[PDB]
Amino acid sequence: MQIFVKTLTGKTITLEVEPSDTIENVKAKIQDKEGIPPDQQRLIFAGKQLEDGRTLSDYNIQKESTLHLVLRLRG
Amino acid sequence: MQIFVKTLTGKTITLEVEPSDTIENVKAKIQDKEGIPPDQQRLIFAGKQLEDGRTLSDYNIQKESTLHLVLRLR
């Protein structure tokens, strides 16, 4: 399925994910597509900071939902 | 010299740079520190987006200046 990923600047990309992906898998797919380390990715949906071990579908993330990405600057 | 680099939420790093460092060099220094690819970085100084082949001193970025970093999602 396709979701959107959006930063605080409004920049938006599309990302192919599976509903059964863990958040870690989602961050890995962002890293593959964009080169951003997973530990640098804070992903937010509907108020909540998304946790790596949880699954997208369990957060009721939907087809064409948008995750918000914030840069962590962890290094 | 030291400069600061900040995200839109206020996350801050320092970098060791020279006035003659190109913007490409500085992005590569950020990649070294943070793992972020240079072509994924946009750096801004006091409203002005910094261009890869120019140097810090071109923008009158002196010691202890702050730059802001955003992702390009390129």
Numbering used by the authors:
A (entry chain B): 1 to 75
B (entry chain A): 1 to 74
Sentences reproduced from the published study:
Ubiquitylation is a reversible post-translational modification (PTM) that regulates many cellular processes, including protein degradation, endocytosis, DNA repair and immune response. PolyUb chains of eight different linkage types can be formed since the seven lysine residues (Lys6, Lys11, Lys27, Lys29, Lys33, Lys48 and Lys63) and N-terminal Met1 residue in Ub can themselves accept another molecule of Ub. The topologically distinct polyUb linkages are recognized by Ub-binding domain (UBD)-containing proteins to couple ubiquitylation to diverse cellular responses. The enzymatic system we established allowed us to assemble large quantities of Lys33-linked polyUb, thus enabling structural analysis of this atypical chain.
